[PDB]
Structure formats: C-alpha cells, structure tokens
Paper text:
Retaining α-glucosidases employ a conserved two-step Koshland double displacement mechanism, in which α-glucosidase substrates are hydrolyzed using two key carboxylic acid residues functioning as the catalytic nucleophile (Asp518 in GAA and Asp412 in CjAgd31B, a bacterial homologue of GAA) and catalytic acid/base (Asp616 in GAA and Asp480 in CjAgd31B). Mutations in the gene encoding for GAA can lead to enzyme deficiency which generates multiple phenotypic forms of the lysosomal storage disorder (LSD) Pompe disease (PD). Herein, we report a 1,6-epi-cyclophellitol cyclosulfamidate as a new class of reversible α-glucosidase inhibitors that displays enzyme inhibitory activity by virtue of its conformational mimicry of the substrate when bound in the Michaelis complex.
The X-ray structure of human α-glucosidase rhGAA in complex with sulfamidate 4 revealed that it binds the enzyme active site adopting a 4C1 Michaelis-type conformation in a noncovalent manner. The interactions of the cyclitol moiety of sulfamidate 4 with rhGAA are virtually identical to those observed in previous reported complex structures of rhGAA with the GAA inhibitors, acarbose, 1-deoxynojirimycin (DNJ), and N-hydroxyethyl-DNJ (NHE-DNJ),21 notably with Arg600, His674, Asp404, and the acid/base Asp616, strengthened by solvent-mediated interactions with Asp443, Asp616, Asp645, and Trp481. The endocyclic nitrogen of the sulfamidate moiety establishes a tight hydrogen-bonding interaction with the acid/base Asp616, providing a structural rational for the lack of inhibition of the methylated analogue 5 due to steric hindrance. The endocyclic nitrogen and the sulfate moieties of sulfamidate 4 overlap spatially with the nitrogen and subsite +1 aglycone atomic features, respectively, of acarvosine reported previously, reinforcing that sulfamidate 4 is a true substrate Michaelis complex mimetic for GAA. Methylated analogue 5 proved to be a much weaker inhibitor toward α-glucosidase GAA (IC50 = 485 μM) and inactive toward GANAB, suggesting that there is no room for functionalization at the endocyclic nitrogen. Cyclosulfamidate 4 proved to be a low-micromolar inhibitor of GAA (IC50 = 5.17 μM) and is 5 times more potent than NB-DNJ 2 (IC50 = 26.7 μM). Kinetic parameters determined with increasing 4-MU-α-glucoside concentrations proved that cyclosulfamidate 4 reversibly inhibits GAA with a Ki of 3.40 μM, approximately 5-fold more potent than NB-DNJ 2 (Ki 15.2 μM). Thermostability assays (TSAs) showed that α-glc-cyclosulfamidate 4 stabilizes rhGAA with a maximum shift in inflection temperature (ΔTimax) of 11.2 °C and a half maximal effective concentration (EC50) of 1.16 μM, whereas α-glc-cyclosulfamidate 6 does not prevent enzyme unfolding at increasing temperature. In conclusion, 1,6-epi-cyclophellitol cyclosulfamidate 4 is a selective reversible α-glucosidase ligand that binds through 4C1 conformational Michaelis complex mimicry.
Numbering used by the authors:
A (entry chain AAA): 81 to 115
B (entry chain AaA): 123 to 197, 204 to 785, 794 to 952
Amino acid sequence: QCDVPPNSRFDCAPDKAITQEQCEARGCCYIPAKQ
Amino acid sequence: GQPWCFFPPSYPSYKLENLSSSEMGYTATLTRTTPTFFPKDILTLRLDVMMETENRLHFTIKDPANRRYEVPLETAPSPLYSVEFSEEPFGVIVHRQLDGRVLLNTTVAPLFFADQFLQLSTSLPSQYITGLAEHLSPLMLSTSWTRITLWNRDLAPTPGANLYGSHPFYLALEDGGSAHGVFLLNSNAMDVVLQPSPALSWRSTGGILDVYIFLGPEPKSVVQQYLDVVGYPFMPPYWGLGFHLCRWGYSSTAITRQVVENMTRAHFPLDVQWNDLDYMDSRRDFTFNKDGFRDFPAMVQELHQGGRRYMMIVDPAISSSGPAGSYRPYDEGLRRGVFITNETGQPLIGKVWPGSTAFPDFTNPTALAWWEDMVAEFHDQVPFDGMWIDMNEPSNFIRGSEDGCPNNELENPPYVPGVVGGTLQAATICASSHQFLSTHYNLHNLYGLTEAIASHRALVKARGTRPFVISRSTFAGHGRYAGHWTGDVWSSWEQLASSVPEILQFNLLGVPLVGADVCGFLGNTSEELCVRWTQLGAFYPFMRNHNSLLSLPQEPYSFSEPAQQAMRKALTLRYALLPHLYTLFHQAHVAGETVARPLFLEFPKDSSTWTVDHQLLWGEALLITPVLQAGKAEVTGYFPLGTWYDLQTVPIEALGSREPAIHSEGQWVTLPAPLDTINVHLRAGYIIPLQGPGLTTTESRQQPMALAVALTKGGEARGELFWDDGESLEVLERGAYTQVIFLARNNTIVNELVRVTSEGAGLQLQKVTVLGVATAPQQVLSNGVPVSNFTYSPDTKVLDICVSLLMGEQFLVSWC
Ligand SMILES: *[C@@H]1O[C@H](CO)[C@@H](O[C@@H]2O[C@H](CO)[C@@H](O[C@@H]3O[C@H](CO)[C@@H](O)[C@H](O)[C@@H]3O)[C@H](O)[C@H]2NC(C)=O)[C@H](O)[C@H]1NC(C)=O
Ligand SMILES: *[C@@H]1O[C@H](CO[C@@H]2O[C@@H](C)[C@@H](O)[C@@H](O)[C@@H]2O)[C@@H](O[C@@H]2O[C@H](CO)[C@@H](O)[C@H](O)[C@H]2NC(C)=O)[C@H](O)[C@H]1NC(C)=O
Ligand SMILES: *[C@@H]1O[C@H](CO)[C@@H](O[C@@H]2O[C@H](CO)[C@@H](O)[C@H](O)[C@H]2NC(C)=O)[C@H](O)[C@H]1NC(C)=O
Ligand SMILES: *[C@@H]1O[C@H](CO)[C@@H](O[C@@H]2O[C@H](CO)[C@@H](O)[C@H](O)[C@H]2NC(C)=O)[C@H](O)[C@H]1NC(C)=O
Ligand SMILES: *[C@@H]1O[C@H](CO[C@@H]2O[C@@H](C)[C@@H](O)[C@@H](O)[C@@H]2O)[C@@H](O)[C@H](O)[C@H]1NC(C)=O
Ligand SMILES: O=S1(=O)N[C@@H]2[C@H](O)[C@@H](O)[C@H](O)[C@@H](CO)[C@@H]2O1
Ligand SMILES: [Cl-]
Ligand SMILES: [Cl-]
Ligand SMILES: [Cl-]
Ligand SMILES: [Cl-]
Ligand SMILES: [Cl-]
Ligand SMILES: [Cl-]
Ligand SMILES: [Cl-]
Ligand SMILES: [Cl-]
Ligand SMILES: [Cl-]
C-alpha cells in the first residue's frame, strides 16, 4: 500500500511540518526522500 | 521537493453515487465518509458535467446545500473528448478521442473539498506545460516539485514569487504536437503544485471547482477556445501601438514638454507622452498641482494639436485624511458608500502615496458610477486619452489596515499558500474586509480586473472612442478590457532576457497588449543594454520606455550618436510595421489569435520549438531573434523548416540617420548581430503591409503603403490588411472598415477585396518588394502597363517595384 514510485507521491502534509507518527496517524505513508 | 508524507492508493476520497445522464451531460453525488485533516470537510458534493461544444468540456463540483462563492463570469459528428468516471476513489478521466491519450485523470490523488481547502489533481500528458501567470519563469514551467502561487502581490518581478496577476489556466503539450488547456474558474488564493510523474495539483483556499477543458488539438486552437470563455482581446486604438515615453520625475509641464521637443529634434517617433505621480496635488488622484503643473490642461491640448496622445497614472486608493468637503473623490465616495469596509462598517483605511487611503470596491455598482463621474469630471479639466492603473493588487504600504486585522478564519486560514510574507495580508488589505459581492478573501485576485472593467467603461463614457487602459494587476479575462506591463523590472540583461517568455505568456492568456519597461525600470541602464532592449522592445506589442525616480535618464535622445542611430532604426521599423501589427490585433480581437507568439504555437509538430522562449513571432510570418546578452556580436536562434528572408533586404524609409535567405531543414543557425542590428526574418509564403514614416501615427497613417512579398520556392504568398479609422467604437458591428487579401501566384500579385468602405478606400500602394525572385525579369507590368521604375538585385534575389495603386481597387502586378 506504501509502494508508490517517488515521482507519483502526492503530499499528505501540505499544511505543516509532520513527524512519521502524525503522518501514519493521518492514514498516510512516511518514506524519506533519498536526498 | 518530493513529499516524505504521501497518500496511499487506499487514502479516503469521495465515492461517486447516482450517476445520471442529462441532455447537457451528467450529474452525480460525491460522498466522503472519512474526514480529512482539514476542518469543515463538505461530506456531500454535487458533480455536474456539461458537454458544451465539440472542443469544450465543463464540469463543476459544488455544495448542493449551500451557495458558495463563484467568480462573476459572462456566458464525423462527435466531440474531440470522451469522459469516464472512477467510482471509488472518485475521478474524472478525459481521453482525446482521436488517439486515446489520457489528458485529465483526477483519480491520481484524493479529492479534498473543505470550506477553505479544495484540492483536485491530474496526470499531465507530458513534461511540457505553460501558463499559471504571473511569475518570472521560462515559458515552459518546471515539473520538478514546483509550487506556483496565485495571489496578486506588489513585488518587483523575481523567480519563485507570487506577482501582480493570477491566471489559473494551463496549456499542456502532447507527444506529436497536439495540446489541450485547463481553466479552473476560481479567484481564491491558490497553490498549483507540479511534480515529475508528471502531474499537477490545484490547491485553492475557497470557492468551488469549476473546470473547463479545451481539446485543441492545435495549441493556437486551445488559446482560441480558452478566449471563447474568458473573452477575446479588446481592439486598441492605432495610436496605442506607437511609442510611449514615461518616467517618474518629469516634475513639471516645462520638463514634460522638453521630452517631446528632444525626441522630435532627434527624429524619434513618439505617439504618447505620459506622466507618473508628478502631475498630482500631494499624490492624490483627480488633482493636479499648481506649481510644476499649473498649466497641465494647456500642455495636454498642445500635445493633441501636434497629433500626439497623453496618458497618466491613476492609483486605486483615495486620500481619506483631507478636511471634510475639500477633496471630492473621498467626500463623494463616502456619501455613495463606494469603499471597502471593515467589521464595524467604516471604510478600511490603509497607507499608499497620499498617506491614509480608502480602497474603492469595484464590485459595487455605485462605485462604478462614482468612478465614471470622477474620470469624466477630471477629463473635463485635462483631456487625457487613457488611464495607466497601478498599485491595483490592491497594494498597501502597511499590513492589512491602520487598525490591523481581526482574528478570524479568513485572516488566519487553515491552509496558507506560498505567498511572499507568509500571510494573505502582506502588502495588501484585510482578507475579511467587505465588498459588495463577497469578502476580499474571495475577490482579492479580481481587484485589478474589476478596476480595469470600471476604467474601460469610464473612458468609453468620457471620450466616446475606444479606451486605452494599461493595468499592473490582472486576472483571467483581463485582455477583454485592458493591457498590461510586467512591472518593476530591473535594468539588467537577465530581466531583458526574462521579458520575452513573459510577453509570450500573456499572449497565450489573451492579454496581447503587453510589454516590459523598455531599458528597465529599477536601477540605471547602460547604453549597450538600452540599445538591445529598444531593439527587442520594438517587438513588444505594447512599447513603453519608463524609468524610476532615482534612475539616470534613458530617453533615446540621452545616448551617444551611434546608440541613437540604432534606437531610431528600431522605432522606424516598428512604425513601418504598424499596419501589420494592427491587423494582428484585429485577428486577436475577432478570432482569439495571439499577436506575439512562441515558435511552438506556430510549429507544434517540430518538438525542437517546445523549449524556445528567447525568440518570438509576430503572427505566423515574422521571426525576431534578439541579442539578450552584453558583448555579443552574433546570436544563435532556431529556424523551423522553410525559407526565412532577412528583413534587411526590404527597403524602409527613415526620417533621421549577411545571408539574404536562410534555407532551414529545422535547425539552429548562428546570425551576425552587431550592436546596430536585431535579426528579423520573414517566412516564405507571407505578404506584410508596410506604411511610410512619421514621428506619430497621425503622420504615418497619411503615408503611402508598401507590400513585402516573401515567395515560396513555388512562387506563392498570402497576406492581409485590416484598416479602420483607428479609434471608433463598434467598427466591426457597423462594418466601418476595409479588409484586403494579397495573393502572389505564377509571377503575379493581386488583391482580393473582402470589404471596402470610406475608411481605407483611398489607401495608396506605391511600392511592392518581392523576395525570392530567382532570375531578373525582362518586364514588370502594373495593370498591364510597364511600371515607371523597378530594380532587381541578383545577389539578394529582391525585385523592388514602384507602382501607383489603391489598396481598395483590384490590381494585377506581374513580371517575367
Ligand atoms: C474600521 O475603520 C475605522 C476607520 O474608517 C477605524 O476607525 C479608527 O478607530 C481607531 C480606534 O479604534 C481610531 O483611533 C483613535 O484616534 C483618536 C484621535 O483621533 C485617539 O484619541 C485614540 O486613542 C485612537 O488612536 C481612529 O482614529 C479611527 N480612524 C478614523 C479614520 O477615524 C476602526 O477602528 C475600524 N474598525 C476595526 C474593527 O478595525
Ligand atoms: C441515490 O439515490 C437514491 C434514490 O433516490 C430517489 O431517486 C432519485 C432519481 C430522485 O428522484 C430522489 O429524489 C429519490 O429519493 C437514494 O436512496 C433513497 O433515499 C431516500 C431518502 O433517504 C429514501 O426515502 C428512499 O427510500 C431511497 N431509495 C432507494 C431506492 O434506496 C440515495 O440516498 C441516493 N444516494 C445519495 C448518496 O444521495
Ligand atoms: C487514472 O489514474 C488511476 C490512478 O492512478 C489509474 O488507476 C490505477 O491503475 C493502476 C496501474 O494500472 C492499477 O494497478 C490501480 O488499481 C489503479 N488505481 C485505481 C485507484 O483504480 C488509472 O489507470 C488511470 N486511468 C487511466 C485511463 O489512465
Ligand atoms: C532636452 O535636451 C536639452 C538640450 O540638450 C537638455 O538641456 C541641457 O541639459 C544639460 C544637462 O544634461 C544642461 O546642463 C544644459 O545646460 C542643457 N542645454 C541646453 C541647450 O539647454 C534638457 O535637459 C533635455 N530635457 C529633457 C527633459 O530631456
Ligand atoms: C544610479 O546612478 C545614481 C547616480 O550615479 C552617479 O551619477 C552618474 C552620472 C554616474 O557618473 C555614476 O557613476 C555616479 O555615481 C546613483 O546615485 C545610484 O546609486 C545608481 N543606482 C544603482 C542601483 O546603482
Ligand atoms: O516604485 S513603485 O513602487 N512602482 C510602481 C509602478 O510599478 C511604477 O511603474 C511607478 O512609476 C511607481 C510610481 O507611481 C510605482 O511605485
Ligand atoms: Cl498507512
Ligand atoms: Cl493532524
Ligand atoms: Cl459569498
Ligand atoms: Cl520543461
Ligand atoms: Cl463638479
Ligand atoms: Cl449581493
Ligand atoms: Cl534541438
Ligand atoms: Cl542550442
Ligand atoms: Cl488606380
């Protein structure tokens, strides 16, 4: 369910800086960009 | 950059339910069952899909339980599009029917629809997308995680910033050279996010989703279809296409008269003299000071006596601090309730040039009547010919108001787009302030457009001829009422180069009357920069040299003799081409055509053109390849497949002081470009009307005309001329114009008379220049009789013919 190609990821935190826990609590995927 | 926190495919969206078919198209209910992280989700929406034309698809997503803010806007056989729907998650899918290409697919991300946050996403068909003004950017927008903010803002143009105007329209190219356009009719603060998949997200802070899709298939057809909805460009007066000269710092009528004198003595054409804030009494609208400007009315009357026009700056904000009864614009505005009001119902007070100011509400019909009266009364004192409307974001020198702004959800919204200053209040008025139609929150991006509409109407009533309005702030559909200049550009090589993409972008958005301040506004120009900027700027559809208060002078007559010669040549060529430029504005006005256009609009099937934005065309036929860097004596430009004739091979007469043809297979060509030269090439197959010289259009319009005939290899060419009185209203409706087609075929040139009336009948044709004549003719005939005189150049293959003909009477010119 979190296997989305990097270029096709749509922002689930456009409103504020978010932590992994808050992101997952929203029902979203947390995967840091590699750069 | 790429988001670390992103939606899984299972993220809750809306579900489509009860899809139904209508005569117009489709209707459905959309239901969200899981709330988003934004407040005030609208859980039940109505979808309406309207199949309006074969090339226009329209859909709306609204709250069926509450009227929401909507932008005020005037209204084999098969469509080019097909539409399908995803049920869960909800999406609209639009295919191009001809090749099955997916143009729109909103299933790619969740639909968000909350009171102050709308988000709709789509796949894009390619990495090539243009539009979403106003930003300092390449014509083709970067898809590398780019956030584009639409929130009208007073800021000197710089990359990555929301600037003076907002145009929520994009044109997307498809592999093979087809294109489509998308218009989101939403005036709220918004971010548009582009990503490399490629995909786009609209993120708006209010209103509804009102979406138009234009199927093209040609880029020129997409622009025309968009302009069908927002309005075809207004027809300018002919004089408006002449040279305009302005600065901040012409501080008296004596100094302003010296500008015209100095231009005239140095043989520089000038149609329109401008003043900035200098004319006013204490920087107030509809006044003039009794020091430097005591004889302002006489100065303007004298300009008119010499065949010139006059323009001056008008700001929106009205001085509120004067003694009661001493300043009619404020006193009468107060009486009639014309101003934007605050929470207690009093005028919102900000700070602009005169000090404390109130802001007119141009959505209030009574404010329109007040503005008409103030313009008409001032015009009875000083007969100005148009209005330069500045600071109409609206610009505020303080944040919000003198009394600050209240703490509410409009001033402090749940989603703030990427605006400079990080707040909707920065450099403007309170978002929760009251206007007749809605709050400033919803109407801000329309403020400049509403002032342009009010000013257009005011000028029609005051003068009874075509209005001439130049506006800083704009919105989609602005071009129906007014033109634009790109604002406070620095006098730099970077801003000279950036002006080309920006002028092209506004032409795609239906604002063809656009230009940048020639030689730049801020800072000090150099002589070399001012020569190159005058050369390029002579191909801006709106050509004005304007200059800031603290800058060194940059009028053409203020430079060295060699620089003056180059600037004179540029102005001479523009004046010679005015009948052609006017005809291009006619095509914009009647058919939604562009005036200045990128190569990709004219040659979309040649993918090499897609990234070219440092060259421009005028219409189909004139390719301009400017030098945009210091120290350059050559330029490399792209030449699409065909023959391009050097315009230097066409004789042009001036009042004061290299390959003849490029044969291109579609390739980059290095051209000589010394300081005194700008490269201009005429496309084979085209005929251009030209007119003799003048220091004004009043003088030039009385001169004999000429044709430049660029033959194809097969000896063919086509062109046209539109002619009217240059300033009357309702010319096309009344039929008060002449329209002529020129055709070259089999060693002959003829005219075809589409319409001939008194306006145009007596136009004299005295010269015909034919490019691409391979062999010297033995004889040249005009209506069957050997001409008085002709010259043939074997080196340039140019045949130059003297004739005595009338544009409005059928002729036949022949050679062999
Ligand atoms: C709505 O706009 C009106 C103006 O149209 C605002 O009126 C301003 O109200 C402030 C007080 O809140 C006034 O300031 C006061 O001035 C007097 C002397 O002039 C001084 O003694 C007080 O200490 C204070 O500074 C201000 O004069 C007044 N402006 C005008 C032009 O009268 C009103 O506050 C606005 N309402 C909201 C809620 O923002
Ligand atoms: C989807 O529509 C159904 C049916 O609605 C009816 O038919 C339509 C053409 C229109 O004429 C409506 O006015 C009709 O009510 C909805 O289900 C009905 O819901 C109503 C009110 O809750 C109820 O009285 C009926 O018994 C239901 N009928 C059936 C056949 O189930 C349904 O709610 C609509 N869905 C959404 C999400 O709005
Ligand atoms: C529109 O976009 C949607 C979502 O990206 C596409 O649907 C997905 O397609 C993938 C890959 O084929 C499937 O494995 C998924 O199950 C689909 N997702 C959903 C939500 O259905 C869809 O293919 C696109 N439509 C078109 C016509 O291109
Ligand atoms: C118009 O040109 C005149 C003449 O060149 C300018 O007046 C001269 O300007 C210099 C300053 O650069 C003065 O020192 C000279 O005394 C002036 N000469 C004459 C003949 O009067 C004038 O400034 C120009 N005006 C504008 C508005 O450009
Ligand atoms: C623009 O120029 C202003 C005046 O500069 C002075 O006068 C001219 C004739 C030159 O000789 C110059 O070298 C002189 O210093 C400046 O006051 C102003 O700072 C300049 N603006 C910028 C942004 O550089
Ligand atoms: O210098 S400004 O901030 N830029 C505005 C405008 O953009 C300029 O064109 C104009 O000359 C100025 C004076 O009226 C305005 O003030
Ligand atoms: Cl999850
Ligand atoms: Cl949260
Ligand atoms: Cl409303
Ligand atoms: Cl690109
Ligand atoms: Cl009066
Ligand atoms: Cl109302
Ligand atoms: Cl290439
Ligand atoms: Cl290159
Ligand atoms: Cl004749």
